[PDB]
Amino acid sequence: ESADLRALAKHLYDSYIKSFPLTKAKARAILTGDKSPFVIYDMNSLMMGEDKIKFKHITPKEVAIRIFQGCQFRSVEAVQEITEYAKSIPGFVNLDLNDQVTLLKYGVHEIIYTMLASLMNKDGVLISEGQGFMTREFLKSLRKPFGDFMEPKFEFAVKFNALELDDSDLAIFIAVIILSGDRPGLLNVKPIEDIQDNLLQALELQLKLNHPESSQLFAKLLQKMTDLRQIVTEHVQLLQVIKKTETPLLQEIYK
Amino acid sequence: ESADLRALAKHLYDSYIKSFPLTKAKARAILTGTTDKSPFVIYDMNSLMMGEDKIKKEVAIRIFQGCQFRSVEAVQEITEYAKSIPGFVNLDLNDQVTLLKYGVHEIIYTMLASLMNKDGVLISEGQGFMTREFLKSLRKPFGDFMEPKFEFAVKFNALELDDSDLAIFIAVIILSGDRPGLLNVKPIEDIQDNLLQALELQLKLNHPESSQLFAKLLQKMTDLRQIVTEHVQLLQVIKKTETDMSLHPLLQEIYK
Ligand SMILES: CCN(CC)c1ccc2c(N(C)CCOc3ccc(C[C@@H]4SC(=O)NC4=O)cc3)cc(=O)oc2c1
User: B256 CA distance to ligand 1 centroid (A)?
Assistant: First the structure.
């Protein structure tokens, strides 16, 4: 029944709103234009912005490093939101406890870069709950190998953002990403796929009603899972390279 | 209109059959095992020597070269099939080249799954069957050349697509708007949109009791890219350890 699928759509939207304080709607208002965010385009802007915004990741040590570490701090925050949001997906909490951990472990990066797109345009990214805008050109300009940390995520955001998904679409797509049966170490795939099948049915009905003239948007969206897993792959490949530049309770909080 | 999409599905299924001599339906009849189509089985170096006589240098290299000559033949069939896709041949010629360059290996591993089960692979048009084990036991670096394709084929094959479903799926793969260097993305995407609509109607009619097959099949495209990626890594190893080992110019140009 449609009524069922719409019920599931609204349920996930309502929970997405409660879990994620900076929404796409909010992020779009801010990026296009009353209270312009503080812009970091250069080093002397950044050094002013630390003294203007009360950044939560700063401690008592070169700039590129401190910016990268700040991205880690936010990702750990975003893991807790996505965790909480996942518990609202019907059937999720009833899975085997290890598979809940396994799906979250392998799902959070995909969802991070998806939701990052909501805060991005060709020109930069909203930081610190949209209090800041860091320009793509000052990110691009950092020392090797941090210089093009974000460049992949920008290219992926620009192409994602062409689909014009809104928050009520992303709520369901994020749910589909968490419930992937192809994650390694899953003990009981069947119920995971049963819930993902229902999430895809809802995602299909939501795209058809919310975007009635965007042909095959469902298919184009699923195609973007490919660009997600590729961004993620080559992100770990930039990490494993950090462990050959980056020359202890902190280390633990992040891993 | 479903009538236009059914027409396009039949068009594509008819070209597929004209273009690929060894279909999935034929490959399955050989594997499940009729008197008239029993293949010769290579499971060790003894049986390899014997088979090299009944079917028609070190073994690892001879096999790898064989897979290469077989990709080169497959590129020719995929090229012929591509020309049959309404609109392909009307695109900018540079984009035709770029769509074949990136699509061909994703199609080769899709269609190689048709010839595979969890024990081995059909070779020489189904006259031979070479066991997963035998291919695993090859000296490094060729030992693990075939495993990732086997792993992908096991999982692809559980969708139980027949040739009519595959003919549309490989059309979707060729008409991919996101290939690097594409001059004119939008005309490819309008072809792909229509192919996607055709695949979606095909899967619901041919597999009515297989929930969200369409979305399961489109996620497989991530598994294909990974096969291609691992393989290029494996080739750059081979080119250093095996300096006496020829590479077919046509695949060298595809790998550039
Ligand atoms: C005397 C040669 N001989 C006996 C020893 C054989 C041996 C085997 C095969 C064979 N096999 C085993 C299937 C393996 O399938 C593959 C594997 C990989 C590719 C991709 C290629 S490899 C590369 O570097 N670049 C590519 O694009 C394509 C197909 C089929 C066949 O038709 O003939 C055969 C002959």
Answer: 20
**CA-CA-CA-CA torsion for A83, A88, A91, A94, nearest 10 degrees?**
60
- Count Cβ atoms within 10 A of the Cβ of residue B139 and give its class: 0-12 exposed, 13-18 middle, 19 or more buried: exposed
| Other Cβ atoms closer than 10 A to A231 | 20
Experimental method: X-ray
* Structure's resolution in angstroms: 2.3
Q: In total, how many domains does chain B have?
A: 1
The widest CA-to-CA distance across chain A, in whole angstroms, is: 58
Q: Does B204 touch chain A (CB under 8 A)?
A: no
Instruction: Provide the strand spans (E) within A41-158.
Output: 120-121, 124-127, 132-135
Q: Half-sphere exposure of residue A191, counting CA atoms within 13 Å on the CB side?
A: 15
What is the token pair recorded at A162? Answer: 């062409």
Rounded-to-5 percentages of helix, strand, coil across chain B: 70, 5, 25
Distance from CA of B211 to the nearest CA of A (A): 7
- Pocket flag, ligand 1, residue B175 (CB < 6 Å): no
CB atoms within 10 A of CB A58: 12
Q: Is A6 annotated as a binding residue?
A: no
Residue A28 and residue B81: Cα distance in Å, rounded?
A: 44
Question: In terms of Cα–Cα distance, which of A119, A100, A90, A91 is closest to A27?
Answer: A119
How far apart CA B182 and CA B102 sit, in angstroms, is 11
The span from the CA of B177 to the CA of B192, in Å, is 8
Nearest atom of ligand 1 to the alpha carbon of B135: 12
Q: Give A22's contacts (C-beta < 8 A, 6+ positions apart).
A: A118, A119, A126, A129, A130
Strands B116-117 and A120-121: unpaired
Domain boundaries, position A247: 1-255
Which of B116, B72, B99, B85 has its CA nearest to residue B13? B85
| Closest to B153 in 3D by CA, of B129, B105, B118, B125 | B118
Edge to edge, the sheet with strand A132-135 lists: A38-40, A132-135, A124-127, A120-121
